Design a protein around this ligand. Sequence first.
Ligand SMILES: CC(C)(C)OC(=O)N1CCC[C@H]1C(=O)N1CCC(C(=O)N[C@@H](C(=O)O)C2CCCC2)(c2ccc(Br)cc2)CC1
Ligand SMILES: CC(C)(C)OC(=O)N1CCC[C@H]1C(=O)N1CCC(C(=O)N[C@H](C(=O)O)C2CCCC2)(c2ccc(Br)cc2)CC1
Lengths: 85, 86
Amino acid sequence: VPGKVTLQKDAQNLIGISIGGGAYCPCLYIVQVFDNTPAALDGTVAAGDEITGVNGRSIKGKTKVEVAKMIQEVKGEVTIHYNKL
Amino acid sequence: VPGKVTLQKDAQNLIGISIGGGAQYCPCLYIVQVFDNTPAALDGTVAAGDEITGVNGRSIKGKTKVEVAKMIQEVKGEVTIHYNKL
Ligand SMILES: CC(C)(C)OC(=O)N1CCC[C@H]1C(=O)N1CCC(C(=O)N[C@@H](C(=O)O)C2CCCC2)(c2ccc(Br)cc2)CC1
Ligand SMILES: CC(C)(C)OC(=O)N1CCC[C@H]1C(=O)N1CCC(C(=O)N[C@H](C(=O)O)C2CCCC2)(c2ccc(Br)cc2)CC1
């Protein structure tokens, strides 16, 4: 089911997730949510979750590195658009 | 980087994993979670976010999660998992 969540960036400029996909494998997922990060303490997102945009912008046909870039550049807080596992 | 592991089922016929993917527009299947104290976990080969390409020498191409899940359920004893390492 589609949702979205705004995550604060930690002092290390992280929300605390890894990602995979974004390849003949075009969908993009959260693979890990790291303990003690803003994404782990929020509780909204989880492994399995499909990522679909990043501050109102789609990630369609972006590489995993491209989406990592996208996310890191957004400072303070970021809004991850998802479809729940 | 491709691989395959043969995992012994436990007492509940489980290897201890949860899968992702295989919808329309999202064909690829993945391991979403490895659950502690299961065969998959204690073997240590596969992990969250590895791609499942094959079970027991046949492809999972163009199957849904449910179908894959019953492909794995219905092999007793042990099951070989063909994957791509994340
Ligand atoms: C979901 C929850 C939270 C109840 O998990 C657990 O607390 N535990 C505790 C012990 C392990 C796990 C469990 O009960 N399950 C059972 C259901 C499960 C499964 O059937 N089996 C897999 C297997 O490990 O062989 C197969 C089939 C799909 C991929 C491989 C599953 C997952 C996704 C789908 Br689609 C269908 C079944 C996961 C392990
Ligand atoms: C990687 C390991 C296993 C060493 O980490 C850790 O134990 N720690 C503990 C705390 C978190 C995690 C962390 O250090 N990392 C840093 C690197 C990381 C990242 O930069 N994530 C970003 C973020 O969380 O905002 C973006 C980029 C991709 C989507 C989110 C990453 C992930 C995927 C890609 Br591609 C590139 C970088 C993961 C979180």
